[PDB]
Ligand SMILES: O=C1CC[C@H](N2C(=O)c3ccccc3C2=O)C(=O)N1
């Protein structure tokens with residue numbers, strides 16, 4: 054009966070990802086980053102996620118991960134901004150960077 058199994062949207066409980074799907078980009082699944090608006094994010098990288106809605110066309114502008122373009126990822130249920138989907142790169146071609154404090158971790 055594991056308690057650190059899956060990640061849900063902290064605002065509504067939508068299933069989003071799984072601890073098994075953590076991805077160590079540049080040798081670490083956690084990346085502490087800032088956007089141009091000065092906001093700091095503790096981003097956890099996942100190979101896969103579900104229950105999101107990706108908004109707009111990809112952009113390479115200010116990407117925290119070299120070679121990847123990003124799209125905003127909202128919770129598909131409640132609209133909470135949960136992170137970004139990254140695409141266009143290599144090994145892997147795509148992944149998700151999700152904001153740790155916007156997810157709730159718990160049992161499957
Ligand atoms: O990899 C990324 C993801 C998107 C991101 N980002 C933001 O969080 C943001 C907020 C306001 C205006 C523009 C940005 C954008 O480049 C960011 O800075 N880098």
Ligand SMILES: [Zn+2]
Pocket residue numbers: 062063064065066067128129130131132133
């Ligand atoms: Zn939600």
